[PDB]
Symmetry: D2
């Protein structure tokens, strides 16, 4: 396939893949994504950093051949860098190794095991295990590798950090850089990526950033080139966002999620929202029947409170909540340093109990559950006024919470 | 709307609603359903048994008018029977009460409170509370009301038209089917019995001990033989009531097939490969397999197949120390259904792929035990299975299938 | 239901409905919408302008009650204004007329017929037919009705135009005004609304705007309060956007749409995109298997070219294209004054013919069809280079077209 | 992957793939399917008949190895048969040729060009072009290749194992079903025949005149009686070949039921009300109705029901002078299927609601005529139907149903 490479610096090209048509990846919704791969042309050696998903290499090979032609160089890769084992970035490694079998493959020790388990044809390939802070000279360009299957690669002379999934966003535009798309789209996508993939590592993000700041390594980063989405020409913008998300900096905002069979829990959810809105607090409303866990958690990330509602069905809450609860148990939002507030609610026709389960699970997920409200069938006008008042009292507590 | 009634016995008509276009109801998938309502014409009085979902009464009113015209009777309803409070059978009650405000409403004591909570305009309506058992005479036809026959729902009743032995069972013995044909014998048996199995699996499973208790009582009392037809609130009318009663007895006592239901989810395909390998092992022993992929399959079809399966396998990869979250929906649903209430603890295996510390399979095993399954083993592997690891899945599936065949029915 | 009204001016409130959970309306996808209704308090009479979808009045009644309480007025509506017959804005009229049966209903002559056909209980209601430029005095506030079944209502003293669907956007936020949400979200939603609902009326928008500019009506508009979405505190921003869309002002951009059974048409679509991108022209890629007609036409609206691809199935193009083609026949993009460029493409296994149908239908929809390309089964490397070259030549022509 | 082969006759095995988790294929909905591949062991040579979709060969290789082991034979393929080029049956050919590069590949002349276009690594493979009625001897078993039997696809052929009368028919007589059971008689007849009807409706309808021509040729010549089993490329194997042959004859000649298929779309619900009212009229005459809502129903199920319906109703509201656009997808699909090729011009009515000038119903009538239907009438109304307008829909449906019952197929 003929496909053009994009120059990102002198002798450095993006040779990635535009996955235009994918709509979901591991339960994360998106309007396409990219698998970013990079080609560094030293005076003596050409290095390929990461690659692409199995079966999607046609674009990558076209861009590699285009870059080599633009550089007046033969079609040859001398060094292969594999920053991560996951197949969205290593899926073409068996093809690359077959075409260039003498090119050493630089990766971590655990990555050698993971890559051969994925791709048995790589058994006996020339792996060069990196045990951190190792560097190689390409001829006027230095690549420093920093580590368990993942690592970052720094092109030292220009300060380009090949950060793999860190600082990535699932976006698929013809534009390659952060500044070429609307800021709201970029930052919303970055927020979704942090919420779904970085939240449980929040304490690690804080610990690592202080080390990097105190050592003086932050100032050596001029560009961040991740494995998905846009390339950051303003690295402090994404670093700042990660710091805010890792420390629990939230808006005066509440995320409400519910499911319903006959509509009563929906009426309650809307009534809680009216109470919250009466205090000038923002609301995001999600209906589990047709909304996505990945968008929900994006909004929980900068919300100070989270309401979850569902009716009772055979003594349990409506089962769609179990998917979100399992996902929240994995994400561990309390790792951000904040225990967001919460309320559990729902309608019932007999013994009830679903709201009691929701309250217990919200506490297990790290939320500070303030109250529960379960009612019988269709809410009366007075019961909807109770939902409003509860939402109003919650919204006052939200505004009093610092940062 | 002009719509014809269907005669089901002398002076008894179906006047229900064909909900042609609904595809899902409380998370239960279906290709339309019906809201079955019935008109019983006595010599002196007419009774309407149940009605329909809010906003769907146009067909019902057309059929009621047609039935009156076929009977040579005035357009009048004397008695309103509510066998349940849920809006799929009581949604038109405010309209019926407004048209016929002196027609008493027969229902249970709790149903009065539930009906007024749904529909405040019914405050002050002429409710007639049925306590345990009560009969009324329509003139040559007797309706006997039986309060909370499965005990669990105090808002429900069965109504028996005694002289012809027609049991108006409400949701009991119902199936979510929408055909122009009204009777059990007018559609393919597999469609009818598959729909009945799905209805039991999703709605009756946790009440299995009560179904058996109620059946033993009815058989020892001699009431079973008075039932000549079962006219439920959804789907087909049973002209062969022992066929559905027999099926309910089998499902309530845990009579299963030499069959395994496998459910999994996957991000990169490794758990899928494992699931297929377990199936190959099971199939090598002549045991049936149903395979479900949680990415796009439905909880309501899954539990239909668990109901007559002797084993259940659940697989998912690990994502941040937990199993892939789609399993949580099915696990919450199984916790509600309580399959152990059938008297059988179906066998189970938990499996999955991992990239680091793993742990998702140990969570699946704990949850399967909480849902009442007898978890025999767990198998978690690293990334893509090797040929030998797929052979271990096959062997595990083969050993499970031998155990499934040795389990007595 | 307890729900607060929002003051938009002295004695003027938004008393609408937040339809939080709707995801589709007449085949138009959205993340909820609103049904905006307005309450105007004259010194002598109170007027309700529009209302809401059947079964969604709970919020509206709560906000009306709240507004009357904030004003120190009794719960009473003296005048009812119905700017449109469609049920998303007239669905509560039977309830409003039942509560206030002596309140006249102001609407156009055709609207009386359509409202009684929807709601037979309104037979005998006190309708007051409007012909155009009719005014009513509420006591210190004047409402001027403009017939344009639909009409605009102007609150003359403050220059507030109640424009019904004109200038609307399908958005559901707690924030009510244009300036309170990200500009990209507002303008993308406005673009989608124009593309799906105003495109075929483009010649009328330009005729009306010229009439309104030549006269002194435009400067009397200080705020545009539509029936969906945000209220425009900057009315020239949306009027300007409507002018651009009605005159065919496009970007150097191409929208590519395709469907595929085995993946060959997808490969072709991606190869055309690579050619287009080599010339610095933007690409939006849609896959009909799971993408939406309403998003597709949003992007066609500011694209200078449109590529449509599909394989042949029993001598016809893959049937999903028929839905988009029927929709484009209704929208009439040539009414913007521009015949956007187009190419038809696809793969076949025998006699083919699907691309010839696509090319004929694109011409019927008003596109300037430049070429067609149909190939046999999987494209070879040379055939993908042909797609690239065709896309490259199209992109040169796109850049030469005067905006 | 370890996976067992299934013996279907002496030295003949199914070695196919269970695609458990697929839900859609080229716009055709299904609950999984299979890619049926077969191994014929003669005394001296083994032949593989078709294979599977790219990336799904793991099961196939396991079953091939298993069948060899069951026969006490080495793991070797001597002859490769490609009854079609399409990748669901040729996707593993590059792997099979790489493992057994001297095994000739029997296929049609066009098929060589199509296979090399899909798979360039097959350039220089040992293709053996078939011209029809050609046979090969495997040692006590004979395979007879029949070029383009349905005529329309020059890439296809049928293979007959002459001694046992097993016809490997590729997609002809196939069904998209995925069960552990392999034969027609091991599953409910309604599931099998409904799946067969769906397969004919979506894939064979436009070839109906060729089906009749081919069958007439086969019957006068007497080759019909040499067919003891039909082993297609998807779904169940026919141990009762006259059952599927009979069904194909009925579908190819336009034998229909007293049945009407109604399809509609709606924005505000008025067209839905009309559709339901037409159905009530039809049902009053004892004629069957299938109702489809284009918002969430599938073209492949719709055309299944059109195939044995004597009439077809299509409704949609007007949106900017055109019918609601979802109808365009169904119309494009019907233009391809050419139901008039069955020899019957099914009756039709176009209907819809409008808010201004209308015109959508006139477009629907023109398109229905282009698709080969006999359009009897059109009915377009303003906004919400009144009770009298719904009575008109009922009466129109009643008159259509009387005409449906008078039609002799
Ligand atoms: C299938 C099903 C099972 C139910 N099981 C229970 C139950 O175990 N306990 C209970 O209190 N209510 C049960 N209900 C009643 C609902 O909880 C009740 O209708 C509630 O008002 C529904 O709220 P919703 O309108 O938000 O769906 C059940 C309802 C359905 C349809
Ligand atoms: C977002 C994400 C989070 C993950 N978290 C973990 C983890 O916490 N522990 C672990 O062992 N593996 C983890 N993995 C790796 C997967 O479990 C691993 O890739 C596995 O092989 C996937 O199985 P599958 O192919 O069935 O999806 C994670 C993978 C992803 C994409
Ligand atoms: C159900 C079906 C019907 C087909 N009909 C035709 C046809 O009428 N004419 C033709 O030339 N090819 C036909 N083909 C072959 C396809 O056009 C061919 O595979 C094409 O390359 C598919 O493109 P895609 O890979 O983009 O789906 C048909 C294929 C299928 C599966
Ligand atoms: C976006 C849109 C465009 C419309 N365009 C037209 C039109 O061009 N001509 C017309 O007669 N009616 C038009 N209508 C009105 C519908 O045809 C009318 O509301 C009809 O009653 C809808 O029927 P349904 O309820 O079955 O959707 C339009 C409606 C909408 C929402
Ligand atoms: Ca340079
Ligand atoms: Ca897309
Ligand atoms: Ca290890
Ligand atoms: Ca349907
Ligand atoms: Ca009487
Ligand atoms: Ca008892
Ligand atoms: Ca851990
Ligand atoms: Ca254990
Ligand atoms: Ca939503
Ligand atoms: Ca008129
Ligand atoms: Ca499935
Ligand atoms: Ca031999
Ligand atoms: Ca011939
Ligand atoms: Ca017109
Ligand atoms: Ca006509
Ligand atoms: Na009421
Ligand atoms: Tb990644
Ligand atoms: Tb029910
Ligand atoms: Tb509107
Ligand atoms: Tb096929």
């Amino acid at each position: 396939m003929k496909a053009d490479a994009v120059k990102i610096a002198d002798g450095v090209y993006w040779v990635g893949v535009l996955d235009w048509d994918i709509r979901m990846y591991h339960g994360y919704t998106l309007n396409g994504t990219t698998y970013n791969a990079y080609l560094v042309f030293g005076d003596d050696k050409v290095a390929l950093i990461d690659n692409t998903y199995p079966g999607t290499s046609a674009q990558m090979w076209g861009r590699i051949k285009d870059a080599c032609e633009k550089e007046g160089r033969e079609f040859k890769i001398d060094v292969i860098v594999q920053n991560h084992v996951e197949k969205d970035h290593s899926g073409a490694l068996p093809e690359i190794h077959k075409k260039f079998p003498e090119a050493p493959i630089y990766c971590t020790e655990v990555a050698v095991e993971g890559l051969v388990k994925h791709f048995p044809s790589l058994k006996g390939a020339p792996f060069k295990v990196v045990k951190s802070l190792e560097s190689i000279d390409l001829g006027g360009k230095t690549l420093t590798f920093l580590e368990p299957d993942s690592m970052f690669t720094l092109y030292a002379e220009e300060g380009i950090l090949f950060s793999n999934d860190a600082f990535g966003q699932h976006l698929c535009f013809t534009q390659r850089f952060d500044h070429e798309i609307p800021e709201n789209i970029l930052m919303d996508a970055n927020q979704k990526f942090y919420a779904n993939l970085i939240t449980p590592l929040s304490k690690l993000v804080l610990k690592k950033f202080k080390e990097v700041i105190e050592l003086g390594l932050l100032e050596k980063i001029k560009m961040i080139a991740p494995s998905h989405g846009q390339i950051w020409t303003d690295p402090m913008k994404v670093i700042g966002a990660y710091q805010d998300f890792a420390t629990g900096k939230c808006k005066d905002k509440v995320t409400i999620v519910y499911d319903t069979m006959h509509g009563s829990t929906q009426k309650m959810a809307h009534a809680f929202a009216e109470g919250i809105m009466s205090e000038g607090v923002d609301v995001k409303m999600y209906f589990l029947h047709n909304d996505e866990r990945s968008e929900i958690v994006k909004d929980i990330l900068d919300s100070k409170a989270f309401l979850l509602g569902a009716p009772t069905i055979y003594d349990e809450p409506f089962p769609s909540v179990g998917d979100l609860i399992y996902y929240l148990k994995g994400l561990k939002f309390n790792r951000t340093g904040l225990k967001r507030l919460a309320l559990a609610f729902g309608s019932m026709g007999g013994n009830g109990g679903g709201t009691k389960v929701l309250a217990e699970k919200l506490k297990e997920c790290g939320f500070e559950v303030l109250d529960e409200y379960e009612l019988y069938y269709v809410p009366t006008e007075d019961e909807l006024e109770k939902c409003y008042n509860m939402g109003k009292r919650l919204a006052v507590k939200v505004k009093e919470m610092k940062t």
